[model samples]
Target chain A: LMVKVLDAVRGSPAINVAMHVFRKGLTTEEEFVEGIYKVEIDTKSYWKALGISPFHEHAEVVFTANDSGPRRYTIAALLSPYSYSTTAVVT
Target chain B: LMVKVLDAVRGSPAINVAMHVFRKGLTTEEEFVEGIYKVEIDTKSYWKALGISPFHEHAEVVFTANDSGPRRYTIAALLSPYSYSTTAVVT
Candidate 1:
């Protein structure tokens, strides 16, 4: 699990959801650095425990912040180990 | 230079040369694991000191051991940070 931080711009609804998730204990690790959110994941253990194959050598979990005007939301992406690609969705 | 290991298959001269280099303190770190050599590099500092562009986000340093009959030598490869490709040469 990794802590995820969302930068709440005053008017972004997506940032609001991320903050709500944080408050609900939905994150594993989190830190706010500069103006970005940093989350850490125990990739090996987390995948194994969930019965999914643990990531291969080059796997990375990344989060992207999307902003439209005064609204912003954090989208989580799971980068595939085999294909070296990422799949993301807004939470 | 990073520590390099060439697994000796009884009579490989390349392994002998690698071991000689190690004995001469030409290596930075060294360890043996399951008959293989593992070396570590302080990538960020090393490249910076040399005025070489350090590896980027997806760069990897890999070593391969080549054996011809009883002869073996360790070939080091530099994986390109931009193209995700590798270039190797035997020393």
Candidate 2:
């Protein structure tokens, strides 16, 4: 089927691209206010090498509160495909 | 100085080890909760290959809030030396 070929192409190993996300923070004052959470993804190498970027696009984050009450979570910024870093924050 | 050789030995490449920091949360609900944050480090492969681990040792995190008032920050978790993951949370 055409879908199969498209999926294969999407996941192809020929795609040697990576993205890194950085700078995350929560919105304290207005829970429903849009743009409370902020994030940035770096696609410099992807643009330079392939002239394409990932689907997510830019590095701003919008958050919708999940079921969990106010608690701590392991905050992580995507550094790259092969490596990344994490931290913990209380909210 | 004799210290130069010691520093050089410390930086040798025969040592191919890496350490990651995780679970970095803030201390709240108390003035200075000593163990408010939690972290875990993965040393499975490191121990397997070299039988020696990185200098920081285990994977646990402890945090002390600085002068910043109740605000937002881009909390990060260290996934590895070259990469990291982060999340945004309000406290």
Candidate 3:
């Protein structure tokens, strides 16, 4: 999965962020581009390192993955100090 | 903001859903694609009509809006019967 998280408040992309995607009930943090891959983004430490306090401990997203002949999946998130917006690319 | 919600459970697009994007605090449901557009999607009604009970009342998204020389923001969501996945296209 291609995961993208942007800083809405700063109008920039969020890098140095480590996140993973797993199946819905996999409490562990963990995609391919088919199935229900729920990605949990650990934004807390990311924001704290930026000297800001965020409202969500992590930004958790669950999406469908498919095989080739299928569109690739990319997850994008726009995060503000206190909010988050989600989107994706299946092309 | 161009909003999109897909049915991850059924592997299809969610249609006939009316959603609006406003500033984070605006209770009035309503987007121009700049600033912080927090879109509240009435996923509840949509899912309910599908004979499926969803887990969220709404799918709320907050993203940064920029002027021309900027990209258009699209909010995409992959919703399951009991979960939601978020992503976006900013181009």
Candidate 4:
């Protein structure tokens, strides 16, 4: 799994944004298999460090992994003070 | 108001994605006023044009414009076949 985060206001990468990936049924292993998982991004703290106030405390994206084999899962995120957006793709 | 669309999978700008912006109360007017507005982006059509099959029929971003004066709004959008994300900022 890969995550690419972009700052909407600056049009730059939102680096060092704390995050974690977890499978729904249990708090479990990596090497993603065919199942559901989620990424919880610590958006609020990221903005705070940048001295900007934001609306949401965090950002999360959940999806199912259906790839037959080990493939790259890409998640893209865009952020602003009042709003944020995310998208996912398997490559 | 300005809209920026990004293709997550490609990590590039999604140019020529057809869209329309309308105030929630009306189907008309330019020059954004202090109120709520929504942008309907033809996501499905966009992906189809690229010979890709996406999940959503369309993508929409609605927000309340609270800027007192003529401030530029930047809406950042990231999209994939099955998901999409959006964020807003004023500059």
TM-scores for every candidate against the unseen true structure: 0.11, 0.15, 0.13, 0.13
Greater TM-score among 2 and 4 belongs to 2
The weakest ten consecutive residues by lDDT in model 3 chain B span: B42-51
Candidate 3 residue lDDT tens string, A1-91: 2333321323222222223233331111211221112233211111112222222334433433222232233434322111233444554
Clash counts for the predictions, in order: 6, 26, 15, 3
How do the candidates rank by DockQ, highest first?
Answer: 2, 3, 4, 1
Model 1 off-target regions past 4 Å?
A1-70, A78-91, B3-91
Give the alpha-carbon lDDT of every model.
0.23, 0.25, 0.27, 0.27
Error of 2 at B33 (Å): 29
- Looking at candidate 2 chain A, the ten consecutive residues that score lowest on lDDT are A42-51
Model 3, residue A29: distance off in Å is 17
In candidate 3, position B30 carries an lDDT of 20
What digit string (tens of lDDT, one per residue) describes model 2 on residues A12-35? 121112222122111123212121
For model 1 the local lDDT of residue B35 reads 21
Per residue, candidate 3 scores C-alpha lDDT tens digits across B9-53 of: 232222222232333311222222221222332111111121222
Please give, for residues B1-91, the per-residue lDDT of candidate 2 as tens digits.
0111112222112111222212211111322212112233311111111212222233342322222123322445332223233544555
Put down candidate 1 lDDT per residue, A1-91, tens digits, no spaces. Answer: 3332322222212111112112111122323212112222211111112212223345444423222233222222211111122233312
C-alpha RMSD of each candidate structure in angstroms: 28.8, 26.7, 24.7, 25.7
Interface RMSD values, listed in order for every candidate: 28.8, 26.7, 24.7, 25.7
Ranking by TM-score: 2, 3, 4, 1
